[PDB]
Amino acid sequence: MNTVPFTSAPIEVTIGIDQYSFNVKENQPFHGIKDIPIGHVHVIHFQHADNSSMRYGYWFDCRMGNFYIQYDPKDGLYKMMEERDGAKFENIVHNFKERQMMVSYPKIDEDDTWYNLTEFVQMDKIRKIVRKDENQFSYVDSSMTTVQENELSDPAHSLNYTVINFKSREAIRPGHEMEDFLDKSYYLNTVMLQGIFKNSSNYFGELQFAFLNAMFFGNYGSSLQWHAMIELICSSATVPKHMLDKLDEILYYQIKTLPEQYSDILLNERVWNICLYSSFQKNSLHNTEKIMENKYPELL
Amino acid sequence: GAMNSSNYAELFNNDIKLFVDDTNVYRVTVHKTFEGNVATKAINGCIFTLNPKTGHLFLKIIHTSVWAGQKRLSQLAKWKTAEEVSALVRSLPKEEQPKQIIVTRKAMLDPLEVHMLDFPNIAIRPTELRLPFSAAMSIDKLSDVVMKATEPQMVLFNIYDDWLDRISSYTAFSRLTLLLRALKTNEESAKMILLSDPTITIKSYHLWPSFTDEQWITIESQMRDLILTEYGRKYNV
């Protein structure tokens, strides 16, 4: 059970850890989050009480080091940093637990939600989408744009998602124009699965990471990427059966976890009505279809 | 973006552009079978690819054989249209290739776009104009060449005959679309107007009669009258 201590909380902020979050008042004595479950990636994220713009946060994995939060008053945000002094850190953490200034990661034991949202997400793949290799953790915010968004400006601060584009030479073999555009199987299985992602789990991990960035930070380009990776599978007549059943599970927990109030900008009407009702895989997403219908019949 | 009444004169500048109309690509008669079910029989069709500045028409004849053993033919027709337009572009010398292709039906954008991926600097554009190019098979010589074809064939025409010797592309194009609009609303009357007078002939290398300037004016007035009448009849205005 790992810990992420905070040096202080100088400004009023809503702190999130995974799908949980807490209100923290200006110069309230808050000094960390304990009992963070080992074995999964995590994200800790922030929204200042004064600037409901700019949600931001840090993807991390406690196996990869000892991380803490510190407020930087020059840059004006909560920063994740790594403590290299292993002893100096158990000291900070133990003394803060002793003074009981830390919140407990509040997992219900029956609850597999976080595992299901993060099954395929690996910190090593996250660090390739958010390139900043001096740090073992990854910063994401509301306004970061993707590499695709840019082609149509600062690269040090981009989300290097895999570019998917249905009207491109990559997507369309010469001679199979019509076939490859109506049935994307070629582009999914040879180009993307065997070619780029190598296997289905890295693909699901990018899909799942894009969703979580869209959900937690309202990152509009992540949402585009999430929908595109869905659409590619659903628009392919030939998908391994194991990918179809896993996808249904993946989407179900994503749709389940979405805030009810946000289903208007996070959910793309056309992609979903196509995937659930028109695509080759219309019949392969029973659990995802049933929860969409019962919870957002308006969008359909 | 989309072509409309505003950016209308762009058709007549010196950027090479083509209109593509796919309406007559997949043509069927519908009939009853012995058992009394309905079946279609396909007849020869054509892609109508037109340079509106010069009058050059690239009439790609679509032989029924292309449909043999194929399903979802109306969808396929759009893709075969884009395949053929793409092959036409590739066949043209570079300085003859269009900078724009304007498709008369939006459903052609994706097929054409996908077929033109090798030509990223060619803009594919829809239009908001209601262009009468479906009536191209009401021009006797174009219908004749399509219906006699025994194989895929490209036939080249100037759809303006020799009009550009005397008038501008803009005026030529308005004459063409006026004629075609009349042939579309009431082909019988439209064709009567064009041929009522046995002394105005069609040259062997032309599509339309050899009207003098004054005769074209009387014709163009006769076509407008026809169009307006048919409209009051359609709507009871």
Curated annotation (Swiss-Prot), chain A:
Compartment(s): Cytoplasm; Nucleus
Top-level taxon of the source organism: Eukaryota
Modification after translation: Phosphorylated on serine and tyrosine residues.
Listed Gene3D superfamilies: 2.60.34.20, Aar2, C-terminal domain-like (1.25.40.550)
Effect upon mutating S236A: No effect on interaction with PRP8
Chief location bin: cytoplasm
GO cellular component: cytoplasm; U5 snRNP
GO terms for biological process, alphabetical: spliceosomal snRNP assembly; spliceosomal tri-snRNP complex assembly
Pfam family, one: AAR2
Residues with the Phosphothreonine modification: T257
Phosphoserine, modified sites: S236
Region (Leucine-zipper): 244-265
Keyword annotations of the record: Cytoplasm, mRNA processing, mRNA splicing, Nucleus, Phosphoprotein
Cross-referenced InterPro entries: AAR2 (IPR007946), AAR2_C (IPR033648), AAR2_C_sf (IPR038514), Aar2_N (IPR033647), AAR2_N_sf (IPR038516)
Annotated function: Component of the U5 snRNP complex that is required for spliceosome assembly and for pre-mRNA splicing. Involved in splicing pre-mRNA of the A1 cistron and other genes that are important for cell growth.
Further details from the record: Present with 7330 molecules/cell in log phase SD medium.
Subunit structure: Heterodimer. Interacts with PRP8 (via RNase H homology domain and MPN domain), competing with BRR2 for the same binding site. Component of a U5 snRNP complex that contains at least the U5 snRNA, PRP8, SNU114, AAR2, SMB1, SMD1, SMD2, SMD3, SME1, SMX2 and SMX3, but is not a component of the U4/U6-U5 tri-snRNP complex.
Family membership: Belongs to the AAR2 family.
Name of the protein this chain belongs to: A1 cistron-splicing factor AAR2
Lineage: Eukaryota, Fungi, Dikarya, Ascomycota, Saccharomycotina
Gene name per UniProt: AAR2
From Swiss-Prot, chain B:
Recorded consequence of changing D21A: Alters protein folding. Severely impaired growth. Strongly reduced growth at 35 degrees Celsius
Superkingdom, natural source: Eukaryota
UniProt note: domains: The MPN (JAB/Mov34) domain has structural similarity with deubiquitinating enzymes, but lacks the residues that would bind the catalytic metal ion. Contains a region with structural similarity to reverse transcriptase, presenting the classical thumb, fingers and palm architecture, but lacks enzyme activity, since the essential metal-binding residues are not conserved.
Region (RNase H homology domain): 7-237
Stretch of the intact protein here: 1836 to 2069 of 2413
Additional free-text comment from the UniProt record: Present with 468 molecules/cell in log phase SD medium.
Gene: PRP8
Name of the protein in question: Pre-mRNA-splicing factor 8
Compartment annotation: Nucleus
Coiled-coil intervals, chain numbering: none
Effect recorded for T104A: Reduced growth at 30 degrees Celsius. Strongly reduced growth at 16 degrees Celsius
Chain's role: Functions as a scaffold that mediates the ordered assembly of spliceosomal proteins and snRNAs. Required for association of BRR2 with the spliceosomal U5 snRNP, and the subsequent assembly of the U4/U6-U5 tri-snRNP complex. Functions as a scaffold that positions spliceosomal U2, U5 and U6 snRNAs at splice sites on pre-mRNA substrates, so that splicing can occur. Interacts with both the 5' and the 3' splice site, as well as the branch region. Has a role in branch site-3' splice site selection. Associates with the branch site-3' splice 3'-exon region. Also has a role in cell cycle.
Subunit structure: Component of the U4/U6-U5 tri-snRNP complex composed of the U4, U6 and U5 snRNAs and at least PRP3, PRP4, PRP6, PRP8, PRP18, PRP31, PRP38, SNU13, SNU23, SNU66, SNU114, SPP381, SMB1, SMD1, SMD2, SMD3, SMX2, SMX3, LSM2, LSM3, LSM4, LSM5, LSM6, LSM7, LSM8, BRR2 and DIB1.
Organism of provenance: Saccharomyces cerevisiae (strain ATCC 204508 / S288c)
